[PDB]
Scaffold this active site. Structure first.
Site, PDB file in Angstrom:
ATOM      1  N   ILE A  28      16.078 -15.717   1.473  1.00 43.61           N
ATOM      2  CA  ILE A  28      15.514 -15.255   2.737  1.00 43.61           C
ATOM      3  C   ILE A  28      14.191 -14.516   2.563  1.00 43.61           C
ATOM      4  O   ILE A  28      13.575 -14.099   3.545  1.00 43.61           O
ATOM      5  CB  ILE A  28      16.490 -14.327   3.494  1.00 43.61           C
ATOM      6  CG1 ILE A  28      16.788 -13.082   2.653  1.00 43.61           C
ATOM      7  CG2 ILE A  28      17.769 -15.078   3.826  1.00 43.61           C
ATOM      8  CD1 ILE A  28      17.737 -12.109   3.320  1.00 43.61           C
ATOM      9  N   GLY A  29      13.749 -14.354   1.318  1.00 42.22           N
ATOM     10  CA  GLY A  29      12.496 -13.659   1.078  1.00 42.22           C
ATOM     11  C   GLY A  29      12.183 -13.411  -0.387  1.00 42.22           C
ATOM     12  O   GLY A  29      12.980 -13.733  -1.269  1.00 42.22           O
ATOM     13  N   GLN A  30      11.014 -12.833  -0.646  1.00 45.12           N
ATOM     14  CA  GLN A  30      10.591 -12.547  -2.010  1.00 45.12           C
ATOM     15  C   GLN A  30       9.527 -11.460  -2.045  1.00 45.12           C
ATOM     16  O   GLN A  30       8.725 -11.332  -1.120  1.00 45.12           O
ATOM     17  CB  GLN A  30      10.057 -13.814  -2.667  1.00 45.12           C
ATOM     18  N   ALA A  32       7.537  -8.285  -5.029  1.00 46.37           N
ATOM     19  CA  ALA A  32       7.227  -7.928  -6.408  1.00 46.37           C
ATOM     20  C   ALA A  32       8.458  -7.390  -7.133  1.00 46.37           C
ATOM     21  O   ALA A  32       8.432  -7.177  -8.349  1.00 46.37           O
ATOM     22  CB  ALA A  32       6.114  -6.891  -6.436  1.00 46.37           C
ATOM     23  N   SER A  33       9.536  -7.174  -6.388  1.00 43.69           N
ATOM     24  CA  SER A  33      10.764  -6.653  -6.970  1.00 43.69           C
ATOM     25  C   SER A  33      11.824  -7.735  -7.135  1.00 43.69           C
ATOM     26  O   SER A  33      12.947  -7.453  -7.549  1.00 43.69           O
ATOM     27  CB  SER A  33      11.311  -5.512  -6.109  1.00 43.69           C
ATOM     28  OG  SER A  33      11.494  -5.929  -4.764  1.00 43.69           O
ATOM     29  N   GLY A  34      11.466  -8.974  -6.810  1.00 45.94           N
ATOM     30  CA  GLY A  34      12.408 -10.070  -6.955  1.00 45.94           C
ATOM     31  C   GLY A  34      12.615 -10.922  -5.719  1.00 45.94           C
ATOM     32  O   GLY A  34      11.928 -10.763  -4.712  1.00 45.94           O
ATOM     33  N   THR A  35      13.576 -11.836  -5.806  1.00 48.72           N
ATOM     34  CA  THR A  35      13.903 -12.737  -4.709  1.00 48.72           C
ATOM     35  C   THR A  35      15.131 -12.206  -3.978  1.00 48.72           C
ATOM     36  O   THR A  35      16.095 -11.773  -4.613  1.00 48.72           O
ATOM     37  CB  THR A  35      14.215 -14.149  -5.239  1.00 48.72           C
ATOM     38  OG1 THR A  35      13.117 -14.614  -6.031  1.00 48.72           O
ATOM     39  CG2 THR A  35      14.447 -15.114  -4.089  1.00 48.72           C
ATOM     40  N   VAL A  36      15.098 -12.240  -2.649  1.00 46.52           N
ATOM     41  CA  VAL A  36      16.217 -11.754  -1.842  1.00 46.52           C
ATOM     42  C   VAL A  36      17.002 -12.912  -1.221  1.00 46.52           C
ATOM     43  O   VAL A  36      16.418 -13.823  -0.631  1.00 46.52           O
ATOM     44  CB  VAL A  36      15.722 -10.820  -0.714  1.00 46.52           C
ATOM     45  CG1 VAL A  36      16.897 -10.362   0.143  1.00 46.52           C
ATOM     46  CG2 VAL A  36      15.000  -9.618  -1.318  1.00 46.52           C
ATOM     47  N   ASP A 141       5.410   3.363   2.518  1.00 50.29           N
ATOM     48  CA  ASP A 141       5.049   1.988   2.843  1.00 50.29           C
ATOM     49  C   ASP A 141       5.689   1.554   4.148  1.00 50.29           C
ATOM     50  O   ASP A 141       6.252   0.463   4.263  1.00 50.29           O
ATOM     51  CB  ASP A 141       5.429   1.035   1.707  1.00 50.29           C
ATOM     52  CG  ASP A 141       4.699  -0.299   1.801  1.00 50.29           C
ATOM     53  OD1 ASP A 141       3.664  -0.366   2.498  1.00 50.29           O
ATOM     54  OD2 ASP A 141       5.150  -1.276   1.167  1.00 50.29           O
TER      55      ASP A 141
HETATM   56  C1  1ST Z   1       9.748  -8.522   5.751  1.00 51.19           C
HETATM   57  N1  1ST Z   1       9.386  -8.951   4.371  1.00 51.19           N
HETATM   58  C2  1ST Z   1      10.578  -9.452   3.583  1.00 51.19           C
HETATM   59  C3  1ST Z   1      11.695 -10.045   4.481  1.00 51.19           C
HETATM   60  C4  1ST Z   1      12.906 -10.447   3.626  1.00 51.19           C
HETATM   61  O1  1ST Z   1      12.740 -10.177   2.231  1.00 51.19           O
HETATM   62  C5  1ST Z   1      12.278  -8.889   1.794  1.00 51.19           C
HETATM   63  C6  1ST Z   1      11.569  -9.180   0.453  1.00 51.19           C
HETATM   64  C7  1ST Z   1      11.198  -8.294   2.752  1.00 51.19           C
HETATM   65  O2  1ST Z   1      11.834  -7.365   3.676  1.00 51.19           O
HETATM   66  C8  1ST Z   1      11.289  -6.061   3.445  1.00 51.19           C
HETATM   67  N2  1ST Z   1      13.413  -7.899   1.647  1.00 51.19           N
HETATM   68  C9  1ST Z   1      13.560  -6.809   0.749  1.00 51.19           C
HETATM   69  C10 1ST Z   1      12.721  -6.301  -0.304  1.00 51.19           C
HETATM   70  C11 1ST Z   1      13.162  -5.168  -1.018  1.00 51.19           C
HETATM   71  C12 1ST Z   1      14.385  -4.540  -0.734  1.00 51.19           C
HETATM   72  C13 1ST Z   1      15.231  -5.007   0.286  1.00 51.19           C
HETATM   73  C14 1ST Z   1      14.809  -6.152   1.026  1.00 51.19           C
HETATM   74  C15 1ST Z   1      15.434  -6.855   2.142  1.00 51.19           C
HETATM   75  C16 1ST Z   1      16.649  -6.676   2.863  1.00 51.19           C
HETATM   76  C17 1ST Z   1      16.988  -7.523   3.944  1.00 51.19           C
HETATM   77  C18 1ST Z   1      16.079  -8.596   4.326  1.00 51.19           C
HETATM   78  C19 1ST Z   1      16.076  -9.627   5.369  1.00 51.19           C
HETATM   79  C20 1ST Z   1      16.982  -9.914   6.430  1.00 51.19           C
HETATM   80  C21 1ST Z   1      16.664 -10.990   7.299  1.00 51.19           C
HETATM   81  O3  1ST Z   1      17.501 -11.283   8.333  1.00 51.19           O
HETATM   82  C22 1ST Z   1      15.501 -11.755   7.121  1.00 51.19           C
HETATM   83  C23 1ST Z   1      14.588 -11.493   6.078  1.00 51.19           C
HETATM   84  C24 1ST Z   1      14.876 -10.400   5.199  1.00 51.19           C
HETATM   85  N3  1ST Z   1      14.184  -9.882   4.102  1.00 51.19           N
HETATM   86  C25 1ST Z   1      14.873  -8.799   3.587  1.00 51.19           C
HETATM   87  C26 1ST Z   1      14.546  -7.919   2.488  1.00 51.19           C
HETATM   88  C27 1ST Z   1      18.296  -7.062   4.483  1.00 51.19           C
HETATM   89  O4  1ST Z   1      18.886  -7.572   5.415  1.00 51.19           O
HETATM   90  N4  1ST Z   1      18.753  -5.998   3.787  1.00 51.19           N
HETATM   91  C28 1ST Z   1      17.779  -5.668   2.738  1.00 51.19           C
END
Ligand code: 1ST
EC number: 2.7.11.1
Length: 293
Positions: A28-30, A32-36, A141
């Protein structure tokens, strides 16, 4: 030392491998701290958010440890909950709750929030900031990307990869770590800034909810900083469309003089927050934004 650092992490995380604990992974995302990823807790059935990172390929190990330790000891209803962490070889896992509603950025770029909905988001963000600041933590931030939303309208702050822990002996920082467009002037114009830099960032997020983007967005980051430091308090496109009480709130968040800028505790008392609609009022915006996303 990557060794003394690895032992630190080893003491922090839960033992074993997470692979057997979670299923149905979905990226669902990425950052500098890794892939989420979004994942299913096999036992409880709770859908969570898991960030996976390879230590070997990680510059500032200290920051990730600090991020985990800060989340662990500063739980709050308006902060995305940290659940656990694991370390398998060089693979670090950080598990936290998942907010299915997406980010505030999606909402402000895809829908049009009204003042009652804006006051509600600002209130929840301020609750997280008052808590953090009173607990000696500056996020540093604050921006719509870091504000996540639940399907029920919950508003929570995340990503403590840049936060700072202060003390009465050392109440100020000088490192430039935030995102340009949301950075407070003093982070540039001078050294030594305090918790109020988060208040300024909140003010910029308010402009975002009003205009769809922060000031100088179309500008180059390097340039934006100069403009922010030299022009200071942003100018609103259509100020006359805003209520007098919202305009006052904005001025208190975006004041140049740090001393004059409202603190979190002070702004929580502001009357603009009292026009807040129930958080459930955000569900329609979230649905629309999500579909469009
Ligand atoms: C808005 N930019 C990015 C969106 C995406 O990935 C990033 C990397 C970053 O969010 C800060 N990102 C993180 C980066 C560092 C720590 C926690 C997270 C983190 C977390 C969540 C989501 C998330 C939920 C969703 O429904 C759609 C996109 C989501 N992303 C999340 C999260 C979450 O539910 N609980 C923690």
């Amino acid at each position: 030392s990557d060794e003394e650092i690895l032992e630190k992490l080893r003491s922090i995380v839960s033992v074993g491998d997470p692979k057997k604990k979670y299923t149905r992974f979905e990226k669902i995302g990425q950052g500098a701290s890794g892939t989420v990823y979004t994942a299913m807790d096999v036992a409880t059935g709770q859908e969570v958010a898991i960030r996976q990172m390879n230590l070997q390929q990680q510059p500032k190990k200290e920051l990730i440890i600090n991020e985990i330790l800060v989340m662990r000891e500063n739980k709050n209803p308006n902060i995305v909950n940290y659940l656990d962490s694991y370390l398998v070889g060089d693979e670090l896992w950080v598990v936290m709750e998942y907010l299915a509603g997406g980010s505030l950025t999606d909402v402000v770029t895809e829908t049009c929030m009204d003042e009652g909905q804006i006051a509600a988001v600002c209130r929840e963000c301020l609750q997280a900031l008052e808590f953090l600041h009173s607990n000696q933590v500056i996020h540093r931030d604050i921006k719509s990307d870091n504000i996540l939303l639940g399907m029920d309208g919950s508003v929570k702050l995340t990503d403590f990869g840049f936060c700072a822990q202060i003390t009465p002996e050392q109440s100020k920082r000088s490192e430039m770590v935030g995102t340009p467009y949301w950075m407070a002037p003093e982070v540039v114009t001078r050294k030594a800034y305090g918790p109020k830099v988060d208040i300024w960032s909140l003010g910029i997020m308010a402009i975002e909810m009003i205009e769809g983007e922060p000031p100088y967005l179309n500008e180059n980051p390097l340039r934006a900083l100069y403009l922010i430091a030299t022009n200071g308090t942003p100018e609103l496109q259509n100020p006359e469309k805003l209520s007098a009480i919202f305009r006052d709130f904005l001025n208190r968040c975006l004041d140049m003089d740090v001393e004059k800028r409202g603190s979190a505790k002070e702004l929580l008392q502001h009357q603009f927050l009292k026009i807040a609609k129930p958080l459930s009022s955000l569900t329609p915006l979230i649905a629309a934004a999500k579909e469009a996303t």
